[PDB]
Amino acid sequence: DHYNCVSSGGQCLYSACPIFTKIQGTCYRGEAKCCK
């Protein structure tokens, strides 16, 4: 979720994770990705 994304060093994005980064979870009720 958003708070886990913040605290883990990821970024919540509606757009795709940048190429070298990976999905770690989601944010905002499953609608966005947590990328790191």
Swiss-Prot record:
<dbReference type="GO" id="GO:0050829">
    <property type="term" value="P:defense response to Gram-negative bacterium"/>
</dbReference>
<protein>
    <recommendedName>
        <fullName>Beta-defensin 1</fullName>
    </recommendedName>
</protein>
<dbReference type="GO" id="GO:0006955">
    <property type="term" value="P:immune response"/>
</dbReference>
<dbReference type="GO" id="GO:0061844">
    <property type="term" value="P:antimicrobial humoral immune response mediated by antimicrobial peptide"/>
</dbReference>
<comment type="subunit">
    <text>Monomer. Homodimer.</text>
</comment>
<dbReference type="GO" id="GO:0042802">
    <property type="term" value="F:identical protein binding"/>
</dbReference>
<dbReference type="GO" id="GO:0070062">
    <property type="term" value="C:extracellular exosome"/>
</dbReference>
<keyword id="KW-0929">Antimicrobial</keyword>
<dbReference type="GO" id="GO:0009617">
    <property type="term" value="P:response to bacterium"/>
</dbReference>
<feature type="disulfide bond">
    <location>
        <begin position="5"/>
        <end position="34"/>
    </location>
</feature>
<dbReference type="GO" id="GO:0019722">
    <property type="term" value="P:calcium-mediated signaling"/>
</dbReference>
<dbReference type="GO" id="GO:0005576">
    <property type="term" value="C:extracellular region"/>
</dbReference>
<dbReference type="GO" id="GO:0031731">
    <property type="term" value="F:CCR6 chemokine receptor binding"/>
</dbReference>
<dbReference type="GO" id="GO:0007186">
    <property type="term" value="P:G protein-coupled receptor signaling pathway"/>
</dbReference>
<dbReference type="GO" id="GO:0002227">
    <property type="term" value="P:innate immune response in mucosa"/>
</dbReference>
<keyword id="KW-0732">Signal</keyword>
<dbReference type="GO" id="GO:0005615">
    <property type="term" value="C:extracellular space"/>
</dbReference>
<dbReference type="GO" id="GO:0097225">
    <property type="term" value="C:sperm midpiece"/>
</dbReference>
<dbReference type="GO" id="GO:0042742">
    <property type="term" value="P:defense response to bacterium"/>
</dbReference>
<dbReference type="GO" id="GO:0005796">
    <property type="term" value="C:Golgi lumen"/>
</dbReference>
<dbReference type="GO" id="GO:0050830">
    <property type="term" value="P:defense response to Gram-positive bacterium"/>
</dbReference>
<comment type="similarity">
    <text>Belongs to the beta-defensin family.</text>
</comment>
<dbReference type="GO" id="GO:0045087">
    <property type="term" value="P:innate immune response"/>
</dbReference>
<dbReference type="GO" id="GO:0060474">
    <property type="term" value="P:positive regulation of flagellated sperm motility involved in capacitation"/>
</dbReference>
<comment type="function">
    <text>Has bactericidal activity. May act as a ligand for C-C chemokine receptor CCR6. Positively regulates the sperm motility and bactericidal activity in a CCR6-dependent manner. Binds to CCR6 and triggers Ca2+ mobilization in the sperm which is important for its motility.</text>
</comment>
<keyword id="KW-0044">Antibiotic</keyword>
<dbReference type="GO" id="GO:0006935">
    <property type="term" value="P:chemotaxis"/>
</dbReference>
<dbReference type="GO" id="GO:0016020">
    <property type="term" value="C:membrane"/>
</dbReference>
<keyword id="KW-0472">Membrane</keyword>
<dbReference type="GO" id="GO:1990742">
    <property type="term" value="C:microvesicle"/>
</dbReference>
<dbReference type="GO" id="GO:0019731">
    <property type="term" value="P:antibacterial humoral response"/>
</dbReference>
<keyword id="KW-1015">Disulfide bond</keyword>
<keyword id="KW-0211">Defensin</keyword>
<feature type="disulfide bond">
    <location>
        <begin position="12"/>
        <end position="27"/>
    </location>
</feature>
<feature type="disulfide bond">
    <location>
        <begin position="17"/>
        <end position="35"/>
    </location>
</feature>
<keyword id="KW-0964">Secreted</keyword>
